[PDB]
Every structure is written in C-alpha cells, then in structure tokens.
PDB file of C-alpha atoms and ligand atoms in Angstrom:
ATOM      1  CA  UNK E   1     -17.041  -0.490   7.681  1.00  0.00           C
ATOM      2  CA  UNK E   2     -19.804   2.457   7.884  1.00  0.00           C
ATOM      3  CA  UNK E   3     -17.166   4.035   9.597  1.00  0.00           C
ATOM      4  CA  UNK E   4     -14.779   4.583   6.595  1.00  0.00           C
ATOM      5  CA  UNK E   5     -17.755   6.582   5.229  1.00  0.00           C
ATOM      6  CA  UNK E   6     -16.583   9.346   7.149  1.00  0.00           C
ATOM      7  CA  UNK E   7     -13.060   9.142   6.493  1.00  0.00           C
ATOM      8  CA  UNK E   8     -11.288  12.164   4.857  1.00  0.00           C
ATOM      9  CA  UNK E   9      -8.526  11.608   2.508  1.00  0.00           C
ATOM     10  CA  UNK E  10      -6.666  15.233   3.271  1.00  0.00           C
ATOM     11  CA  UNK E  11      -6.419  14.272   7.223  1.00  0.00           C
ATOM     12  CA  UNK E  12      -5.265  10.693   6.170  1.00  0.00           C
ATOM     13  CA  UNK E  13      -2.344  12.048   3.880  1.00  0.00           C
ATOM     14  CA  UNK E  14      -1.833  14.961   6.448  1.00  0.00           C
ATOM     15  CA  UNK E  15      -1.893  12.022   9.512  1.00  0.00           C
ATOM     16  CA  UNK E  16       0.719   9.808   8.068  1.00  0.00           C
ATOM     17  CA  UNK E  17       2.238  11.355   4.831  1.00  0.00           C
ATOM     18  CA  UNK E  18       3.406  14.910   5.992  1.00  0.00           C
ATOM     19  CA  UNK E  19       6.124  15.708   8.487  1.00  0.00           C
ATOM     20  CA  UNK E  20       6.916  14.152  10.983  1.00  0.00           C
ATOM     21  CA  UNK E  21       6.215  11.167   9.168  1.00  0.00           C
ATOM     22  CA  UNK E  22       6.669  12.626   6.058  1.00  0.00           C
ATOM     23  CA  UNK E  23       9.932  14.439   6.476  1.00  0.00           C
ATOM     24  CA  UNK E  24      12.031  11.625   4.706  1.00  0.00           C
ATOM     25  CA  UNK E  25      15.553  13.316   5.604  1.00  0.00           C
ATOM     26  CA  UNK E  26      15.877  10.482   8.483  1.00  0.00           C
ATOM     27  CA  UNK E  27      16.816   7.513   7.122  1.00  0.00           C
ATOM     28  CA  UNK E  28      15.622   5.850  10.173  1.00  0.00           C
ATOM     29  CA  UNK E  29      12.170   7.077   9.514  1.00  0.00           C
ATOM     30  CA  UNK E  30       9.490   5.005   8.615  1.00  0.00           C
ATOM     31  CA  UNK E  31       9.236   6.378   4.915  1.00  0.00           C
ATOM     32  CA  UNK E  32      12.489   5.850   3.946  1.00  0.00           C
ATOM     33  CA  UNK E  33      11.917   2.198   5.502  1.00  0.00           C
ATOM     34  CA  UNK E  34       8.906   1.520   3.433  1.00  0.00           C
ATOM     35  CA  UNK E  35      10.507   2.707   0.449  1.00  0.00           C
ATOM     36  CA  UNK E  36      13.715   0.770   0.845  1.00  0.00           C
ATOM     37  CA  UNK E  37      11.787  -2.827   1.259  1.00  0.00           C
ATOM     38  CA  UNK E  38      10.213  -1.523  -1.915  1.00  0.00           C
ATOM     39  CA  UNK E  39      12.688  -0.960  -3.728  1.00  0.00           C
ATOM     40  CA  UNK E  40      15.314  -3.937  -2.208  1.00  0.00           C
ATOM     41  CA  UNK E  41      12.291  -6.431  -3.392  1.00  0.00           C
ATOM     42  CA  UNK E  42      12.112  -5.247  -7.306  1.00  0.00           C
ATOM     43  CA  UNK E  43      15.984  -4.675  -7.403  1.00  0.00           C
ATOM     44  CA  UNK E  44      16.471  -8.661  -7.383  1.00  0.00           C
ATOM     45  CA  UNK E  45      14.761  -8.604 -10.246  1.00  0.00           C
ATOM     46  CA  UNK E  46      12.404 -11.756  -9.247  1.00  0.00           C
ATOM     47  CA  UNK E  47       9.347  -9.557  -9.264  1.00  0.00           C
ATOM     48  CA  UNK E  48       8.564  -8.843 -12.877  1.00  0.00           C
ATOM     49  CA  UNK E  49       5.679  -9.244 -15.386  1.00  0.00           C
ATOM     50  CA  UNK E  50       3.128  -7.188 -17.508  1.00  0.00           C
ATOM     51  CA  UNK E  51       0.142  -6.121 -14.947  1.00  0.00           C
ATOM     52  CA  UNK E  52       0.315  -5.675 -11.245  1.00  0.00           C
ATOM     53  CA  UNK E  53      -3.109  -4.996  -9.058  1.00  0.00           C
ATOM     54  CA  UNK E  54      -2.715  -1.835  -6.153  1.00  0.00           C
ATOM     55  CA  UNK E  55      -5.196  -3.188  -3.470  1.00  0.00           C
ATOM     56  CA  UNK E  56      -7.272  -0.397  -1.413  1.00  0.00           C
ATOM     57  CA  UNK E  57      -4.484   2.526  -2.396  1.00  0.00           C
ATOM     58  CA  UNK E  58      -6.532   4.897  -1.147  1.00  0.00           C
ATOM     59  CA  UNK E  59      -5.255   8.668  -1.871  1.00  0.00           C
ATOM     60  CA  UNK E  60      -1.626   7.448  -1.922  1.00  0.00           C
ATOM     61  CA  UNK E  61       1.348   6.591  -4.857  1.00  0.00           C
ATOM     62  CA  UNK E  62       4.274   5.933  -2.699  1.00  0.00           C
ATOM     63  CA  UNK E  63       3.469   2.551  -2.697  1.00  0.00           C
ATOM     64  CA  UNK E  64       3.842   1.778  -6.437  1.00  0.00           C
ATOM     65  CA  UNK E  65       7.221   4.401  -7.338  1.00  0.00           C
ATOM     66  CA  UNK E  66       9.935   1.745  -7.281  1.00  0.00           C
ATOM     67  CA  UNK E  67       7.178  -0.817  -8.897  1.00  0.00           C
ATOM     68  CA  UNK E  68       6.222   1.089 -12.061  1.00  0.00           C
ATOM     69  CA  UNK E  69       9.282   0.407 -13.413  1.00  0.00           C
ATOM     70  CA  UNK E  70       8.741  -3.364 -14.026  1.00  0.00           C
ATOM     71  CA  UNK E  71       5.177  -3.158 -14.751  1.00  0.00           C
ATOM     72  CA  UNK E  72       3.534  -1.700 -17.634  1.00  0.00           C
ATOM     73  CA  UNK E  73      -0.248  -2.194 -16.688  1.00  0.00           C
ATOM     74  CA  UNK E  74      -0.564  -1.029 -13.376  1.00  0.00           C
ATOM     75  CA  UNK E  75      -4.539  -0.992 -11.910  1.00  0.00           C
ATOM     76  CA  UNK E  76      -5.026   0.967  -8.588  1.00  0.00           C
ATOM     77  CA  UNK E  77      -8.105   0.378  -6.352  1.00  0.00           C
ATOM     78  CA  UNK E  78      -9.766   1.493  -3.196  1.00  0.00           C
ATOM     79  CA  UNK E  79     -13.369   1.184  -1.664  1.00  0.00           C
ATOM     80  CA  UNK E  80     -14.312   4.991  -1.250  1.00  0.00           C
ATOM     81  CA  UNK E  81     -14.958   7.104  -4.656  1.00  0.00           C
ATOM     82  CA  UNK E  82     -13.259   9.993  -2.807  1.00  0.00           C
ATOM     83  CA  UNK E  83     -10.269   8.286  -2.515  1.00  0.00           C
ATOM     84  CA  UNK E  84     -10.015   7.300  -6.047  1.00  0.00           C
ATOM     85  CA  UNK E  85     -10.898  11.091  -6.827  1.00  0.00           C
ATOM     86  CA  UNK E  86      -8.215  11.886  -4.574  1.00  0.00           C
ATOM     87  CA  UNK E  87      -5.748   9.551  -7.065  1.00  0.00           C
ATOM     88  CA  UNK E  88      -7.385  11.048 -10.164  1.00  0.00           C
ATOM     89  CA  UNK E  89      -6.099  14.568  -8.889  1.00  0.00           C
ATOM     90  CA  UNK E  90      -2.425  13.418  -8.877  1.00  0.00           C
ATOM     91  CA  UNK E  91      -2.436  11.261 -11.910  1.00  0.00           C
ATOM     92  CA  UNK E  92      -3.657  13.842 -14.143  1.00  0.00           C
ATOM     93  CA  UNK E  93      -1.351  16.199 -12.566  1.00  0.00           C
ATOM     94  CA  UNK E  94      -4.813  18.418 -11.338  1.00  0.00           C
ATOM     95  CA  UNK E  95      -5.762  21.144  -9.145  1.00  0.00           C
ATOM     96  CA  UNK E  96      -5.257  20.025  -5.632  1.00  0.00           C
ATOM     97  CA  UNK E  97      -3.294  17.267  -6.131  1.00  0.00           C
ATOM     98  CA  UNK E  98      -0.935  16.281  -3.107  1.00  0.00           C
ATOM     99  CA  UNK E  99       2.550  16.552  -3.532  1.00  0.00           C
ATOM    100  CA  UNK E 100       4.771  13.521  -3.275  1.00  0.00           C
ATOM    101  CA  UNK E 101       7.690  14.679  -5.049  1.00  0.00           C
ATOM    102  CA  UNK E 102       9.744  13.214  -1.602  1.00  0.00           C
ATOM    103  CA  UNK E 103       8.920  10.476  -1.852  1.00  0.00           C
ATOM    104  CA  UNK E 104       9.570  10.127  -5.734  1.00  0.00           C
ATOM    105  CA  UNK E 105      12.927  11.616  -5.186  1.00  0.00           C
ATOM    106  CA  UNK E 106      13.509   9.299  -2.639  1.00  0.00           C
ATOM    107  CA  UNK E 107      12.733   6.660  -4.604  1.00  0.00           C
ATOM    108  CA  UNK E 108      15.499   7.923  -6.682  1.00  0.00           C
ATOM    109  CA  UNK E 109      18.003   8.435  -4.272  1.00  0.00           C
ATOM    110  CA  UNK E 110      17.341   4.927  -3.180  1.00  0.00           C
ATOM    111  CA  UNK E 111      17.298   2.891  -5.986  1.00  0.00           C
ATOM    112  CA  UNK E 112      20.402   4.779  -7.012  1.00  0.00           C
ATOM    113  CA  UNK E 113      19.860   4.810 -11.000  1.00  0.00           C
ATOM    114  CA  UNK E 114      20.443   8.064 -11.150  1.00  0.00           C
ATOM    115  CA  UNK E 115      17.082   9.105 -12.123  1.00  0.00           C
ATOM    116  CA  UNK E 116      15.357  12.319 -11.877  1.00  0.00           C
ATOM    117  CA  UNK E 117      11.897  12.430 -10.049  1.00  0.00           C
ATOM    118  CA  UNK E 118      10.197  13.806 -13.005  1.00  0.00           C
ATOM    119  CA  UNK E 119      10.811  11.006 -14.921  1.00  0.00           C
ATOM    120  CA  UNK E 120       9.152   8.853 -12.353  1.00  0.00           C
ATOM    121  CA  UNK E 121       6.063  10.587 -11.574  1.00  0.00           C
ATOM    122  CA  UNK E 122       6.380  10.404 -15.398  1.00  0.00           C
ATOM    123  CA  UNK E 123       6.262   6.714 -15.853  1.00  0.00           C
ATOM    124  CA  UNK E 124       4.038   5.962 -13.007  1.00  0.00           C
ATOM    125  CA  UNK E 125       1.244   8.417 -14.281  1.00  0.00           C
ATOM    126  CA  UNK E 126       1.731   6.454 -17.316  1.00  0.00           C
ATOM    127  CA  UNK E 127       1.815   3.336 -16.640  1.00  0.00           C
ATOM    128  CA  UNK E 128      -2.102   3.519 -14.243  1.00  0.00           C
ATOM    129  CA  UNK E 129      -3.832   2.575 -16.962  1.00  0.00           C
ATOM    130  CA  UNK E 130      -7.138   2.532 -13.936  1.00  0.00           C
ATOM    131  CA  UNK E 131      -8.497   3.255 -10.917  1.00  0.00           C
ATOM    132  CA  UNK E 132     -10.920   1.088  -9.650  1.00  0.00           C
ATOM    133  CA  UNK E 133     -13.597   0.382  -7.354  1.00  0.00           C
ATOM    134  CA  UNK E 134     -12.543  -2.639  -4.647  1.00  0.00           C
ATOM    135  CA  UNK E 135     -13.958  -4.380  -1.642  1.00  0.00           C
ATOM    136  CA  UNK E 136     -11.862  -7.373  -0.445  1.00  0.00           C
ATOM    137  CA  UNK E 137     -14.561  -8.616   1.648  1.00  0.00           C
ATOM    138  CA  UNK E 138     -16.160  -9.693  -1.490  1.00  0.00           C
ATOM    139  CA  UNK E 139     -14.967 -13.465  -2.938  1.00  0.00           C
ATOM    140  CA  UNK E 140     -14.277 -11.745  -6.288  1.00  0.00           C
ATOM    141  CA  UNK E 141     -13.154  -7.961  -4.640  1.00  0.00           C
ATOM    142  CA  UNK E 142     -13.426  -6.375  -8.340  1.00  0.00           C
ATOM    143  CA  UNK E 143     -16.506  -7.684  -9.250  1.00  0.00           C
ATOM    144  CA  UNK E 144     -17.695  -9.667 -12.268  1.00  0.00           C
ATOM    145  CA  UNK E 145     -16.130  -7.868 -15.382  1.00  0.00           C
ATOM    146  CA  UNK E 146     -13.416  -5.781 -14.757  1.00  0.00           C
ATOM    147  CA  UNK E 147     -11.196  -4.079 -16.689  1.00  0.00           C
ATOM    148  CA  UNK E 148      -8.296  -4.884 -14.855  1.00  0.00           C
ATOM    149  CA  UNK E 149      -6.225  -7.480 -16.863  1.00  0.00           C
ATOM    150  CA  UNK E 150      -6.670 -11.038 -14.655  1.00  0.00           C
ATOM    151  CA  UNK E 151      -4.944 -12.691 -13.321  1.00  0.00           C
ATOM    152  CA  UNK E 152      -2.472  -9.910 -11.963  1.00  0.00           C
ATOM    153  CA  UNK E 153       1.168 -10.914 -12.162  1.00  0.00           C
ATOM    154  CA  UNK E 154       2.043  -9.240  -9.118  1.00  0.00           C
ATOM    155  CA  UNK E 155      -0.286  -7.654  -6.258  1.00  0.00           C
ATOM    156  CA  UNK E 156       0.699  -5.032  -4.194  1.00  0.00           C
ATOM    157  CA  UNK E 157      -1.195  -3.998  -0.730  1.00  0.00           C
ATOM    158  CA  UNK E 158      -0.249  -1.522   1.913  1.00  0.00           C
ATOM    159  CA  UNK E 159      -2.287  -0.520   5.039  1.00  0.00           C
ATOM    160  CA  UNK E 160      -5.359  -1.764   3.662  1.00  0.00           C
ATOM    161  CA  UNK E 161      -6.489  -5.719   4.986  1.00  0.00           C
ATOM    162  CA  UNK E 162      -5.777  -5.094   8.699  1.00  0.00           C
ATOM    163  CA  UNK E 163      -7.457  -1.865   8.548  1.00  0.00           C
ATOM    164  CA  UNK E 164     -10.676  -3.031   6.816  1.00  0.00           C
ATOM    165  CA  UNK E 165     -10.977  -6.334   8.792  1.00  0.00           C
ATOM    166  CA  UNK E 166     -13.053  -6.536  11.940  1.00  0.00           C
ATOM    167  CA  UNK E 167     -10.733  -9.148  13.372  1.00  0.00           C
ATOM    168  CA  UNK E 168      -7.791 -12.037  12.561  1.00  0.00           C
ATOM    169  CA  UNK E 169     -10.566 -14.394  10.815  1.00  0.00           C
ATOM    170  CA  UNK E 170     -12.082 -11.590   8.281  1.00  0.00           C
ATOM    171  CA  UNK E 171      -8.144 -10.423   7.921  1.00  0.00           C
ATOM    172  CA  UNK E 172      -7.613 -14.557   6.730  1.00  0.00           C
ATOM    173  CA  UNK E 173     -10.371 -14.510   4.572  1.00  0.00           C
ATOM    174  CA  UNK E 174      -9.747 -10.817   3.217  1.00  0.00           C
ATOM    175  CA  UNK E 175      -6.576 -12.815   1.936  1.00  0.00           C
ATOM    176  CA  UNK E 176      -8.015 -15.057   0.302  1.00  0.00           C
ATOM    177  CA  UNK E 177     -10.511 -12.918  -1.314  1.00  0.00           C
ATOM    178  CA  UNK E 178      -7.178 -11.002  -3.230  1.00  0.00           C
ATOM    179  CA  UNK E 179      -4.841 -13.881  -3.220  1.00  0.00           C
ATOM    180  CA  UNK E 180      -7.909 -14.931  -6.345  1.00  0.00           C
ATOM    181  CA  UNK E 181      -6.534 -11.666  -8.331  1.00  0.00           C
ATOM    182  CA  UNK E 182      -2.954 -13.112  -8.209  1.00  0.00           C
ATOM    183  CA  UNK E 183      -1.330 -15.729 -11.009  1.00  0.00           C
ATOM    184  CA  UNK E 184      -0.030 -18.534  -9.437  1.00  0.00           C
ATOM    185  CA  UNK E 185       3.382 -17.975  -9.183  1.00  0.00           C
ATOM    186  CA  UNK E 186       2.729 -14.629  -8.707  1.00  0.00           C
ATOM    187  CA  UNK E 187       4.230 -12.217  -6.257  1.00  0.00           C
ATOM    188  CA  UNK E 188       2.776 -10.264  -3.224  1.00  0.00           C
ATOM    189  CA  UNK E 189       3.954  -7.348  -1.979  1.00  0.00           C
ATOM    190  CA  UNK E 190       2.672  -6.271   1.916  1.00  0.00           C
ATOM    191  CA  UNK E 191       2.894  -3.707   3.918  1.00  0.00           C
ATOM    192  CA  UNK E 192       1.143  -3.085   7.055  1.00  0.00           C
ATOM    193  CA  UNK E 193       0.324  -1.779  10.669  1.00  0.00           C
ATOM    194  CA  UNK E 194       1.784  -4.012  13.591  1.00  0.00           C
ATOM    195  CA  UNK E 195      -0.183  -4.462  16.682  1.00  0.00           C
ATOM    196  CA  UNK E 196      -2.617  -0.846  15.814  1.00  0.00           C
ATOM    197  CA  UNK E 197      -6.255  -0.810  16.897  1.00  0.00           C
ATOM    198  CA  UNK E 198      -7.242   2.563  15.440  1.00  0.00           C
ATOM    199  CA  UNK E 199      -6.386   5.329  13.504  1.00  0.00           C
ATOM    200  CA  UNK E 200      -7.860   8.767  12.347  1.00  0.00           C
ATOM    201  CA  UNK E 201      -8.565  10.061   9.086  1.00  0.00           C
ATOM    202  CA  UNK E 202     -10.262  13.078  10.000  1.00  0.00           C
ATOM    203  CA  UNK E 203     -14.006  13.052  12.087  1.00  0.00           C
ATOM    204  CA  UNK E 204     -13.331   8.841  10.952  1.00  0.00           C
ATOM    205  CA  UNK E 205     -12.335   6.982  13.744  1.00  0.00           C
ATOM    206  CA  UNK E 206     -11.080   3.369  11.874  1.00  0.00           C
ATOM    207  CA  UNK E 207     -10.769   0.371  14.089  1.00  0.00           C
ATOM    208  CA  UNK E 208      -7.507  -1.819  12.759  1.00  0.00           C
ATOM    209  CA  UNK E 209      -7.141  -5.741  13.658  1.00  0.00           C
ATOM    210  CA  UNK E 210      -3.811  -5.664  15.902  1.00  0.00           C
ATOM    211  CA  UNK E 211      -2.155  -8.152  13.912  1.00  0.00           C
ATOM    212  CA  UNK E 212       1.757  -9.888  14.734  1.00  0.00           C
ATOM    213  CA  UNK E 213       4.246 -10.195  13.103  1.00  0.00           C
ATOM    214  CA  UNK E 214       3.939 -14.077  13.217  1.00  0.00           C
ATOM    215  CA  UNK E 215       0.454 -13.885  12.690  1.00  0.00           C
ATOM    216  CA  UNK E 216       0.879 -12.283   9.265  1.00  0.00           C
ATOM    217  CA  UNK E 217       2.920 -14.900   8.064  1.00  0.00           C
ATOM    218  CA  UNK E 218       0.713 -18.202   9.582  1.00  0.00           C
ATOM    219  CA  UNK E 219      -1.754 -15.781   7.663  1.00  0.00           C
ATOM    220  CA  UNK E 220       0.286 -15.969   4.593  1.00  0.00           C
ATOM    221  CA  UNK E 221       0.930 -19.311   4.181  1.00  0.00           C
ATOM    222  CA  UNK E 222      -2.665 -20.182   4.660  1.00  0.00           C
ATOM    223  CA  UNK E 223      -3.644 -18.369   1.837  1.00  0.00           C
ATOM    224  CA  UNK E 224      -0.951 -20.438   0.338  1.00  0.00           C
ATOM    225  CA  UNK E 225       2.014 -18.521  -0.079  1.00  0.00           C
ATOM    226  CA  UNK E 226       5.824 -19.458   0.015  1.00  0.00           C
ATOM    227  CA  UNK E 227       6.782 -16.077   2.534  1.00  0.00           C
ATOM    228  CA  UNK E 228      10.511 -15.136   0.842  1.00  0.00           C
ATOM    229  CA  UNK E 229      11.145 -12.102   3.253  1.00  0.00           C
ATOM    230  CA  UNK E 230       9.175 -10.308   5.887  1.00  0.00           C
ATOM    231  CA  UNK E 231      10.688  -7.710   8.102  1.00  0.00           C
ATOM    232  CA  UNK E 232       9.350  -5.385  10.772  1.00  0.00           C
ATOM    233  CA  UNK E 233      10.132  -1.600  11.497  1.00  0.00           C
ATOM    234  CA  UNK E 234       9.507  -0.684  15.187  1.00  0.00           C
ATOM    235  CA  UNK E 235       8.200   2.859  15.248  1.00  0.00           C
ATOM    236  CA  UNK E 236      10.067   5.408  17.058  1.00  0.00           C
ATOM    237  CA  UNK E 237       8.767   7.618  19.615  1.00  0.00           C
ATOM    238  CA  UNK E 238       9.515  10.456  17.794  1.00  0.00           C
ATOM    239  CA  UNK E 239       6.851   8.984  15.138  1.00  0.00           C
ATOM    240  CA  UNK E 240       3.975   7.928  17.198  1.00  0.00           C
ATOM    241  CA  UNK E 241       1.733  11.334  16.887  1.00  0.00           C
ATOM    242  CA  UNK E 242      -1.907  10.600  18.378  1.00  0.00           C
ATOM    243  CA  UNK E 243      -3.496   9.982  15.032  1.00  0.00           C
ATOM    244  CA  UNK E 244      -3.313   6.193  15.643  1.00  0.00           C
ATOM    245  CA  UNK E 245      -1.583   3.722  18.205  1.00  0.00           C
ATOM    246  CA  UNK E 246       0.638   1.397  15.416  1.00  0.00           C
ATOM    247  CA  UNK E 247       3.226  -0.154  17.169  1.00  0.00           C
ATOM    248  CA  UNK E 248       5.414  -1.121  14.485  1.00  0.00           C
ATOM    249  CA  UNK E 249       5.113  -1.840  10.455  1.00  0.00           C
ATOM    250  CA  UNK E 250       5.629  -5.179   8.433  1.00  0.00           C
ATOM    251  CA  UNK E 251       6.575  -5.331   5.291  1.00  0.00           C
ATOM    252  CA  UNK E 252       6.011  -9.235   3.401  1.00  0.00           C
ATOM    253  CA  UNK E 253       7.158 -10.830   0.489  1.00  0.00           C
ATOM    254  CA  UNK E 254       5.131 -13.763  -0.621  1.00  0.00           C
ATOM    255  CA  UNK E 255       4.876 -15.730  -3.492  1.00  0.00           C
ATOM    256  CA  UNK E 256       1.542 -17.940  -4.407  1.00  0.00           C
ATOM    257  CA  UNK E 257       2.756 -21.981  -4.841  1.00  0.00           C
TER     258      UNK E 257
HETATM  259  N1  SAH K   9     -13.478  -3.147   2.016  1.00  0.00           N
HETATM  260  C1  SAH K   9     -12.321  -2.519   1.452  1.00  0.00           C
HETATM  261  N2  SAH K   9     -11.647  -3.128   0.477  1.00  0.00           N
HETATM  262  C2  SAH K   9     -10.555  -2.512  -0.029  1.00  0.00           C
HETATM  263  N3  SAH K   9     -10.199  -1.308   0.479  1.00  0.00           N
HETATM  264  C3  SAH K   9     -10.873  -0.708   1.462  1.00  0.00           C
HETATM  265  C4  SAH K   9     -11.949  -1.313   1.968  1.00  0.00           C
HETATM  266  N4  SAH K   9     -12.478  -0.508   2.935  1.00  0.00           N
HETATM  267  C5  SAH K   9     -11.677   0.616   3.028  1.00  0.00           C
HETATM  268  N5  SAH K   9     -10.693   0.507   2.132  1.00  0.00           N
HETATM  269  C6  SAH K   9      -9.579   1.427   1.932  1.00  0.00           C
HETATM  270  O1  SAH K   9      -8.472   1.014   2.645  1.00  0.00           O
HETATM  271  C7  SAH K   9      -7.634   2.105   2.530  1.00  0.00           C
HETATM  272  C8  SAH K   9      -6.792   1.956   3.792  1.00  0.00           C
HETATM  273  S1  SAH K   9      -5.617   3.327   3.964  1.00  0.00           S
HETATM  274  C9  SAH K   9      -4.222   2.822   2.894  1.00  0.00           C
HETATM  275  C10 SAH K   9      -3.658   3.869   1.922  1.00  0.00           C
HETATM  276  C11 SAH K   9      -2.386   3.345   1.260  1.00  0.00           C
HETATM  277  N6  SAH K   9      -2.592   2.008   0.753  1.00  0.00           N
HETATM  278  C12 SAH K   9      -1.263   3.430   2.275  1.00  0.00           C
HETATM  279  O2  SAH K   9      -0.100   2.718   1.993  1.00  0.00           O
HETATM  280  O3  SAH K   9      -1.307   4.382   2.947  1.00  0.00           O
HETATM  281  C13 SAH K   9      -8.558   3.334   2.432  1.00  0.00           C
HETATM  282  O4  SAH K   9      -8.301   4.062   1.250  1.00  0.00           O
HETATM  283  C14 SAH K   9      -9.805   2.736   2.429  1.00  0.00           C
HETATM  284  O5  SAH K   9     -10.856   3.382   1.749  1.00  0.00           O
HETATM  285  N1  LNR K  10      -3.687   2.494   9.043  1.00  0.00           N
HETATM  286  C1  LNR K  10      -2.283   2.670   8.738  1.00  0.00           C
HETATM  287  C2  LNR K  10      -1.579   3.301   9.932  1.00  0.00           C
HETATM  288  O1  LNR K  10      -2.426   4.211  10.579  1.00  0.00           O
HETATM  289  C3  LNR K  10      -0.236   3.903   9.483  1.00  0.00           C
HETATM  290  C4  LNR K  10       0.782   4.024  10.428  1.00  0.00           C
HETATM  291  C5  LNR K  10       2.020   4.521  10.064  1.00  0.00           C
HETATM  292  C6  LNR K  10       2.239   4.883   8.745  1.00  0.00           C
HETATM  293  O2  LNR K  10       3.461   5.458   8.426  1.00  0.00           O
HETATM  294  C7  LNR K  10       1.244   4.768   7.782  1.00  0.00           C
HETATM  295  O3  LNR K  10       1.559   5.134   6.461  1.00  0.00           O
HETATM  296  C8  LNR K  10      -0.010   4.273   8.147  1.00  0.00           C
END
C-alpha cells in the first residue's frame, strides 16, 4: 500500500491514457472497448437513479462520461490527495488539467445522440457534486460521516480493487467493504485488469492481484450480486507497452439481491 505513496498521477495518465492506448481511432482498442460496455450498460436504461459513488477514480473521468447522464449526484473518490487534486484540475476546468476531450467525443460518437463533447464535459463537471477521500480496505471505505448521499444507487469502479488488494482474499473482502455503499437493488459497474501483477505510475512500482475472469464473478456473487453481463477484452500486442503486464480487461455488470 506504502507503495502507492510514490505513485505519480502524470505517468499513470501518460502510461495508460495517451497514445497508444489513448489513440481511440481503433475501434479495436481498448478505449473504445471500455467506453462501449459503458455506454451499452446505461443505454438499456436499467441503470438509473439519483446518486452514483466513483470508487478509487484516481486522476481519471472516462469512467463516468456515458454515466453522468442518468445520475445527478455523482461523488468521485480515491485514496491519494494528489489524485483527487489531479480531478480538481479538470473539474474546474484549471491550469494543468489533462485533456480528455477523446474520450468525451467518443463517448459521443458512441452513444450516437448526437451530442457535442462540450456539452458533456459540461454535464459531468456538473453533476460531481465531490471528491472524496476512500480506502476500501476499511469496513465503512468513506468513513463515519460523509457527505456522499448513502446508500449510492449505483457504484461504479474501474482499475481500482485488484490493484489495491494484496491478494484474491483482500480483493473478496475489498468487495464487500463497497458493496456496503450500494442500495440493495443497486447496480455495479466493473472494470478491471485480467491476470496483471504490476504496473507503473511513475518511480511507483504497484503490485496488482492477477485475478480471472471466473474468479471475478465467484467474487461477485459472494458479495451477493446477481452478475447480468461480464465480458473480457484480450489486449493486443500492439497495446501491451512495458508499463504493466495486464493480460486482458473485464468489464462486470452486477446487481446487489
Ligand atoms: N485503498 C484504496 N482504496 C481506494 N482506492 C485506492 C486505494 N489505494 C489506492 N487507490 C487508488 O486506486 C487507484 C487505482 S488506478 C485507477 C484509475 C481509474 N479508476 C482508471 O479507470 O484508470 C489510484 O488512484 C489509487 O490511488
Ligand atoms: N492498473 C490498471 C492497468 O495497469 C491498466 C491496463 C490497461 C488499461 O487500459 C488501463 O486503463 C489500466
């Protein structure tokens, strides 16, 4: 965990959220990917409410652009202040800020409303009414009295148990800790590294559970979920860059029964 102390939001975004990886002209990328699953998932129209939860966002959006839309209280979260400094920077439109106007305009492009990227970034910015502190090691991974409305109607998480969890046991129980955040009958949207044991983020070197496909839903309906769709993107050669070892991505589904 000491380790993420060390970890440097620029080289994280650069790592995984620039080209190669963040050239989203390829539709067989892993971006576009992501962002379809997204998008697919709210387009039923199943996943709806008032307040969804962003668990351990780190310095990234992309995650929430197709969600914003059917969510007017939407609380992001992450463990490391710089991280949630890196957020600030992009939801007040700051100095520094990274861009992901690709992604928004993919976004567009894929949910295929017609609407402008502006407009997006627009009701996203919006509609992050807080960022907050996390640690989903912790039985109540917000703390005592937080701000953030509870329960959540919807949780999203992306990247963030697998890579926090020292193996498959803290990963269950990591699960648990959130799946407390989400209204019964709520929905859970994840996304995460298949089969990765590390990553870099800079001079941090992040150890990562190598997790299954399989695994991730036994995981899932421990925690006591009904899994309604979980899919798996293999990564491409062309993609696999020597800042990490991922093998593939997941992207679940799951609703709490
Ligand atoms: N104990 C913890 N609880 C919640 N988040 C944690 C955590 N320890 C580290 N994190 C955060 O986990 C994040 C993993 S990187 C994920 C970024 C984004 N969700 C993505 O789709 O790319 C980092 O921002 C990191 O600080
Ligand atoms: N820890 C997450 C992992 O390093 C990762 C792999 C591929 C990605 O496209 C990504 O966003 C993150």
């Amino acid at each position: 965990a000491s380790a993420y102390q060390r970890f440097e939001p620029r080289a994280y975004l650069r790592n995984n959220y620039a080209p190669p990886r963040g050239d989203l002209c390829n539709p067989n990328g892993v971006g576009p990917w992501k962002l379809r699953c997204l998008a697919q998932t709210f387009a039923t129209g199943e996943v709806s409410g008032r307040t969804l939860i962003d668990i351990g966002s780190g310095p990234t959006v992309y995650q929430l652009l197709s969600a914003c839309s059917h969510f007017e209280d939407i609380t992001m979260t992450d463990f490391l202040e710089v991280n949630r400094q890196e957020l600030g920077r992009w939801l007040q439109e700051e100095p520094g800020a990274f861009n992901w106007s690709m992604y928004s305009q993919h976004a567009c492009l894929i949910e295929g409303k017609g609407e402008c990227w502006q407009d997006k970034e627009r009701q996203l910015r919006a509609r992050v009414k807080r960022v907050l502190p996390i640690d989903v090691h912790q039985p109540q991974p917000l703390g005592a009295g937080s701000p953030a409305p509870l329960p959540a109607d919807a949780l999203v998480s992306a990247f963030c148990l697998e890579a926090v969890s020292p193996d498959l046991a803290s990963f269950q129980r990591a699960l648990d800790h959130i799946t407390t955040l989400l209204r019964p009958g709520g929905h859970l949207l994840l996304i995460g590294a298949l089969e990765e044991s590390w990553y870099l983020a800079g001079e941090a070197r992040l150890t990562v559970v190598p997790v299954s496909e399989e695994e991730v839903r036994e995981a899932l309906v421990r925690s006591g979920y009904k899994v309604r769709d979980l899919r798996t993107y293999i990564m491409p050669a062309h993609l696999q860059t020597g800042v990490d070892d991922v093998k593939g991505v997941f992207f679940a589904w799951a609703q709490k029964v």
